[PDB]
Design a protein around this ligand. Sequence first.
Ligand code: NDP
Ligand code: NDP
Ligand code: P65
Ligand code: P65
Lengths: 538, 529
Amino acid sequence: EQVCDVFDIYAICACCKVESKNEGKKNEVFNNYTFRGLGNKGVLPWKCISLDMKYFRAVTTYVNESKYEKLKYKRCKYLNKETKKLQNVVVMGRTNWESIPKKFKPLSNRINVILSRTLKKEDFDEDVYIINKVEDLIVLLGKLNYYKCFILGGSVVYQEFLEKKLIKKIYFTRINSTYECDVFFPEINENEYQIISVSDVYTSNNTTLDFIIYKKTNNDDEEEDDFVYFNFNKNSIHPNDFQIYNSLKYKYHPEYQYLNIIYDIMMNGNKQSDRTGVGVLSKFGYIMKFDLSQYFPLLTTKKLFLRGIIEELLWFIRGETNGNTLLNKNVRIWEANGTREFLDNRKLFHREVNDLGPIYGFQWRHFGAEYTNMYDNYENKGVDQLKNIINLIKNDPTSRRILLCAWNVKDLDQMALPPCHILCQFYVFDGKLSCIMYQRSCDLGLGVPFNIASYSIFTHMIAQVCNLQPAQFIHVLGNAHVYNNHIDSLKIQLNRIPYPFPTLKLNPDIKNIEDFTISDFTIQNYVHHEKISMDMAA
Amino acid sequence: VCDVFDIYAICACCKVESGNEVFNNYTFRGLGNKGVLPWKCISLDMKYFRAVTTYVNESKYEKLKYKRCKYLKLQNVVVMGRTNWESIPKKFKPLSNRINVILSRTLKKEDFDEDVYIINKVEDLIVLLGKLNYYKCFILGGSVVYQEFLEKKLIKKIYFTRINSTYECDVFFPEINENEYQIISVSDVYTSNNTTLDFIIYKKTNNKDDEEEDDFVYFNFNKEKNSIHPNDFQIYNSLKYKYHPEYQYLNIIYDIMMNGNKQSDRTGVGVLSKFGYIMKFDLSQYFPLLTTKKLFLRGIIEELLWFIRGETNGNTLLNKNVRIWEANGTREFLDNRKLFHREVNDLGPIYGFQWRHFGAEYTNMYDNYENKGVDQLKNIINLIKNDPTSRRILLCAWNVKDLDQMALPPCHILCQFYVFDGKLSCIMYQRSCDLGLGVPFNIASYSIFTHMIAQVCNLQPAQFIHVLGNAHVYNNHIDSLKIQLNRIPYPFPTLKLNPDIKNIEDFTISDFTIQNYVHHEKISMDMAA
Ligand SMILES: NC(=O)C1=CN([C@@H]2O[C@H](COP(=O)(O)OP(=O)(O)OC[C@H]3O[C@@H](n4cnc5c(N)ncnc54)[C@H](OP(=O)(O)O)[C@@H]3O)[C@@H](O)[C@H]2O)C=CC1
Ligand SMILES: NC(=O)C1=CN([C@@H]2O[C@H](COP(=O)(O)OP(=O)(O)OC[C@H]3O[C@@H](n4cnc5c(N)ncnc54)[C@H](OP(=O)(O)O)[C@@H]3O)[C@@H](O)[C@H]2O)C=CC1
Ligand SMILES: Cc1nc(N)nc(N)c1OCCCOc1cc(Cl)c(Cl)cc1Cl
Ligand SMILES: Cc1nc(N)nc(N)c1OCCCOc1cc(Cl)c(Cl)cc1Cl
């Protein structure tokens, strides 16, 4: 029995990102050591992240009474002993202690302990224990009645507790912003500690953050029976391939909505072939939800560029169907569907190369108008859906008819291809806008991460020009499939741990949906793993 | 008394041949016929029975050995009547892995061996259970065994299989006093041997690592509603396991009632609403016709047959006493739609028109539209038979161009189909869902449609997946939904189609039969007049 398990000694910290160099930091690398800034100038690097404070307080103050008698027995056995409100103990480097504002001290409902050489009990007015050696802390825990013991930091205090192998778990807040720092959390050794849980992502005081838990690596109840009774009733891909993924206990990060779908398709999907030969695995009907008020959901388990998909979005809004516009901005999302061959194979022998036909943009601005060619002038022809939904959101917000629909049955065969994203339904409550997008056909490997981002942005754009705040983006998948030759790559991705999401900012001067331009969009604090080739062949 | 020795009954009860029929828990009471079981094989019940009576947990025994002695290879005790035993096929006797026990008089240990037990009277088993080292004790019954054991109040849990079909029977399970026992769990619904069934669990009433368990609390540090009370949902909350598919609809009602946003609507009524729910029903296992209130299906089938005809004439339905579209077809309703030049009950280019003629120009409800617009319905049928893995098998009612001409825009946006291994699944997207009156009907409708489409395409139905956009409960529906929430569902009915019908246009009202619909009594959602 080691000292850490017996005495239930844990660390808890909060780390931001810190100011590196600008010599090629458009394309920089990220890892766990990305978040490492602990202090600056004897205080915290940031003003107030109240949600972290709330977390910190709740963890360090939470005790479970019933669980104690069994810890009150474990510790006693270790020290050779037989067997008013239970409190946790918290330990602080002296400098850490000085940094805390007076009105917070001693930390309420906790047994305060302070590490110091240069100071002694006489230097303190407060109900606190002073100790001058780590060893004395162990001696003290021996004597006291407590639930858990949390090391509250000091990088010095952190360093010495890790290297003595005293920390059973690190409760770690990732603060997804950059600040000046002079003090840093020790680099965690991946062989000594592994992440086992990952929380939801939140925003607090203008930054996203999540909370992760590292664990030390070792290298009534009648109704519990009823559960077994009621449980009395394909692809054998290999366990080990999901070592990391399957080791996590809590996968609460929103990116897991995506990743669990992949997992599900890999384990349970249906083997099917296209009329061609390319094999997929597929399943029918999934849903993901995303809280746009808390983060922007750009996947972090691989790198995504957003310029293209933003250009495509602006191109939809202008009602364009001319692929050349996109190619001239070096965006090739639609190149393949615009070739002479692709159009001929679509029986559009009379369609000019890159004239995509009555697709999205056209349906959004001119539904029902007779498509001629990509250069025609369609103004006041067809139904301006975009305008009407913006008008409904503004003037009739309780409407259950706020739908934007790409799927024009009549023009389907004239489109280079039918829309993958069928429709958008909007919802308004309490000055907040939510949006369901229904997608009939979903390539999970490449399509889906881009599609989540596109419609997230669109919700922001619509909300803003209607003076509302974005709320939920809800993505419905009909035929959801993975390409067989993406399997190895998705395997890799599925074992990366997500990072806290970035945030999206829109120029606030833009007040009509038609008036956005590319430089009106900024992603801030995109932290992400390395880019992946989905087929390992190119 | 019973709490200590862990004595439970386990049964299976079908419905009995009875010359308005009322349903309650007593509806399921058929135990046996001619000294045999009323039904032939029901293989899933035999699997449940074997699994429950055999299963043991050794790491939970010490707690019970502690309990029993104080008061004074681990297996379970199984107890039956003589008649009961003399009907089990010998190739199953002795009951593999179970302390076999018989409660008889006429015979004793002078006939059969000592490894198998035989006992004298009711309170000659308790005595025999001190002597014994066993997990739990199951009364496999026989009518009188059950009877006398419930009589003496020696039963803690009844594990009760509801067989949702009717057979001739000579013996019945006794009435269970619902003041003495209550249901705390209800399972998923299943099809076995041409019948649906579920498994419920009765409980006697009380009427006088841990590392990660903490970590769970932390992740909850930030957790967060409406003027609905707790004690009104007594029965609903007092259930531990709610695996019956009907809870997919009821849980949504609960969620909107607890967490719904207050809104006043189109007319000024009051609704609670949320946005985005999903439900899934396994059509190969049952027909999802709600059981916690009475539903009628003639009208909705006629609406569907009307849609398939491509009809937009509301008078066709009114002449059959299908009044679903009545209010939408009145002079006054259409004038308020700015449809001053539309004949009454001419609903415009709605569903039928869209499914058979999307894109054609609408004139009036009497015109001939033959070969005008796209026949979506014909097209999706061809895709299903000839290109089953297509991801474009969709039937879309929402014609943006025609919306304003419709009496009202479709509540039911679209249907997507999916085919794999001879089976057909369907997703229906619904933009606006009146959870109280509308959605129970909507579920039945597209379920039936999915059957119709599968059959004409030579496939088996698989899943109906209902996606809900704006999901709302009417405020004046609240009291009734509360009553409904505390009702326990019954096993679902089945839908039979006439197997002769092989083309989508050939169905008639007489080609549809609902079987074994067991249901609670009718509720009026608006409890006013
Ligand atoms: N964001 C976060 O999660 C956290 C941030 N912080 C920040 O970090 C900074 C402080 O970190 P740091 O400079 O490392 O200071 P520390 O809190 O680590 O304090 C170090 C001091 O504590 C005492 N001490 C440490 N180890 C021993 C030992 N075992 N025996 C006796 N005394 C010991 C000594 O006190 P003495 O000088 O009296 O001899 C030493 O100088 C501040 O900016 C603070 O705001 C702190 C905690 C958490
Ligand atoms: N569907 C289901 O869940 C089940 C159905 N069954 C069916 O039930 C039918 C049998 O029911 P039924 O005959 O009414 O009941 P039993 O099978 O329990 O048979 C009753 C017999 O048990 C003995 N017995 C009853 N009370 C006592 C007592 N106080 N002390 C000692 N012995 C007693 C008597 O046998 P003796 O002559 O020796 O005195 C009596 O004749 C069968 O057809 C069987 O298939 C059986 C179990 C479960
Ligand atoms: C803030 C924090 N957050 C996390 N997740 N872990 C910590 N150890 C931590 O530090 C706890 C000790 C410092 O406490 C404070 C410091 C300052 Cl500067 C202020 Cl203003 C308030 C408190 Cl409580
Ligand atoms: C089958 C069953 N299922 C449940 N759920 N409970 C029972 N008591 C039960 O009866 C078990 C005792 C009767 O057993 C049999 C009777 C006949 Cl007739 C045959 Cl063929 C086979 C068995 Cl096992």
